[PDB]
C-alpha cells in the first residue's frame, strides 16, 4: 500500500521530502496518461465553509477527472450549517457517516486537523484553514517549479510582495527548505517582511537568504520569481501608494531574466504584475493554476488507492 494511503493532508510540515516527491511523480504520470475511472463510485464532500471559487472549481474538476462524484456546499453567505449551535466535531461526525473523503476550507486555523479527530477513517484534505496551511497550493506550486526547472534543489527563488501575511509564501519556503542548496531572496515593504520564525528555520538549516529592495538587484540570478498580492488594507491607501506600490512587475523589468526564469502568482493578481508580462515566455501564472488539477488529482488518487497502477 503506498505511504499516503488513507492519510489526512493537513499540513506541509507533516509531509516528508519523500512524500512530496511521490505526489509529484504521480501528478506527472496522470498528466501524461489520464485515469478517468480511478475513483469511480467514490463520493467526495467539497465543504467550503468559507467561499473560495478558484480553489473549489479546481478541486471538484479534478475529482471529476478521476471519475468521482461530488456533494458539498460553499458558504460564507449562508448554507444552513452551525445552524442552531451545531459544533464542527458534530458536522464532521455526521458527514463522514457517508462520503469517502472530505475536502474542506474553513475560516479558523486548526479546523482541518480537528476534523481529523472526528472523521473516523475518511481522509480529510485541507483546502485552507485561516492563516495557517494550504498544502494543495504548495503542491501545485512545487509541481510547477519542478516541471519548468527540472529540479527542486539548487534553485534561486525570489519571493516578492507581502511576505508577512502571505500564507502561501510561508509554506513554500518550508517545503523548499526540505530540498538542498536553494537560495532565497525576499523583496518586501518593511511593514510586510518575512517573519522571524521563517528566517530562524532557514538559518538553523544552513540555507542562504537575503533581503533586497528592488527586483533589479536580483533578476539576473533568479529561476523562480514568486509574486504575492499586497492587500491594500494591510497598509493605508497612502502607504500602499507611497513608494511601496513599487513591488510591481512589468515586461520591461524582464530583460535580463535567464531564459528559464518563470513568474508564479497564486492569484488574484490585480496590480502587481502588469498585463504586458502575460505575452512574455516567463509568464507562468496561468499554467501554474492548470497544474493545480494534476497536483490535486494526485493527492486524491494516492489517498483513496492502496496500490497505484502506472
Amino acid at each position: 500500500a503506498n505511504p499516503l494511503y488513507q492519510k489526512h493532508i493537513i499540513s506541509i510540515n507533516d509531509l516528508s521530502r519523500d512524500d512530496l516527491n511521490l505526489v509529484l511523480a504521480t501528478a506527472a504520470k496522470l498528466k501524461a496518461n489520464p485515469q478517468p475511472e480511478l475513483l469511480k463510485h467514490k463520493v467526495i464532500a467539497s465543504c467550503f465553509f468559507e467561499a473560495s471559487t478558484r480553489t473549489r472549481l479546481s478541486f471538484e474538476t479534478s475529482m471529476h477527472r478521476l471519475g468521482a462524484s461530488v456533494v458539498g456546499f460553499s458558504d460564507s453567505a449562508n448554507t444552513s450549517l452551525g445552524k442552531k449551535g451545531e459544533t464542527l466535531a458534530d458536522t464532521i461526525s455526521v458527514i463522514s457517516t457517508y462520503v469517502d473523503a472530505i475536502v474542506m476550507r474553513h475560516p479558523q486555523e486548526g479546523a482541518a486537523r480537528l476534523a481529523t479527530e472526528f472523521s473516523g477513517n475518511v481522509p480529510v484534505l485541507n483546502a485552507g484553514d485561516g492563516s495557517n496551511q494550504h498544502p494543495t497550493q504548495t503542491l501545485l506550486d512545487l509541481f510547477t517549479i519542478q516541471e519548468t526547472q527540472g529540479r527542486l534543489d539548487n534553485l534561486h527563488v525570489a519571493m516578492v510582495g507581502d511576505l508577512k501575511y502571505g500564507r502561501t509564501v510561508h509554506s513554500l519556503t518550508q517545503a523548499l527548505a526540505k530540498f538542498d542548496g536553494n537560495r532565497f531572496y525576499f523583496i518586501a515593504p518593511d511593514a510586510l517582511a518575512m517573519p522571524q520564525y521563517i528566517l530562524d528555520m532557514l538559518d538553523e538549516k544552513g540555507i542562504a537568504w537575503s533581503l533586497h529592495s528592488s527586483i533589479e538587484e536580483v533578476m539576473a540570478e533568479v529561476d523562480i520569481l514568486y509574486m504575492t498580492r499586497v492587500q491594500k488594507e494591510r497598509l493605508d491607501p497612502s502607504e500602499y501608494a507611497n513608494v511601496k506600490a513599487q513591488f510591481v512587475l512589468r515586461a520591461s523589468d524582464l530583460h535580463n531574466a535567464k531564459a528559464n526564469m518563470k513568474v508564479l502568482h497564486p492569484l488574484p493578481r490585480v496590480d502587481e504584475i502588469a498585463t504586458d508580462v502575460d505575452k512574455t515566455p516567463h509568464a507562468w501564472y496561468f499554467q501554474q493554476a492548470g497544474n493545480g488539477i494534476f497536483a490535486r488529482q494526485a493527492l486524491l488518487a494516492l489517498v483513496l488507492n492502496r496500490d497505484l497502477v502506472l
Partner: protein, 153 residues
C-alpha cells in the same frame, strides 16, 4: 520671416519659444498645460538636434506670452528649458523655470481615499525642497508623497 530650416527652425514675430525641452516632454507639456487651445500659430519641433542634450523638443507660440508663474509650472518636467520671449524678431527676454510653491491642476493625488478624486475641485500640491528631491503635499488630504510617486498615478 527669417530662414527657418528644421534642425533649429527660425523666427516667429512676437511670442514665446520654450526651447531645451528634454526629449519626449514637449508633447506632455502641450497636452498638460493645454497650450494648444488658442487660435495662434504654434509651431512645434520634436526630437531635434542641438545644444548639448543631443536631441531636444521646442514649442513656438506666437502672440501669446506666458510668464513668470506659467514658466514655473514647467519646472518638474522641463527644468532646464529656456522661455524666450520675442518681440519684433528680437529675444527681448530669457527665463528659466524655478520650483513653484503650488502646482495646481496637473497632478493626481496618489492617495485613493482623498476626496479630490471624486469632485469639481482641481488638484493642488504644496512643493518642498529643491533638486535633492521634491515633496508634494496634497491640499486636501494633507498627505505628503514623493514627486516620483505623484508622477506615475
Amino acid at each position: 520671416m527669417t530662414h527657418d530650416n528644421k534642425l533649429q527652425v527660425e523666427a516667429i514675430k512676437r511670442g514665446t519659444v520654450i526651447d531645451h525641452i528634454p526629449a519626449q516632454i514637449g508633447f506632455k507639456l502641450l497636452s498638460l498645460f493645454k497650450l494648444t487651445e488658442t487660435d495662434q500659430r504654434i509651431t512645434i519641433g520634436l526630437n531635434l538636434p542641438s545644444g548639448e542634450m543631443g536631441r531636444k523638443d521646442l514649442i513656438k507660440i506666437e502672440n501669446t506670452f506666458l510668464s513668470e508663474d506659467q514658466v514655473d509650472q514647467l519646472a518638474l518636467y522641463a527644468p532646464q528649458a529656456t522661455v524666450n520671449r520675442i518681440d519684433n524678431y528680437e529675444v527681448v527676454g530669457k527665463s528659466r523655470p524655478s520650483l513653484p510653491e503650488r502646482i495646481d491642476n496637473v497632478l493626481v493625488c496618489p492617495n485613493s481615499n482623498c476626496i479630490s478624486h471624486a469632485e469639481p475641485v482641481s488638484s493642488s500640491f504644496a512643493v518642498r525642497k529643491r533638486a535633492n528631491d521634491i515633496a508634494l503635499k496634497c491640499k486636501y488630504c494633507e498627505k505628503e508623497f514623493s514627486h516620483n510617486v505623484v508622477l506615475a498615478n
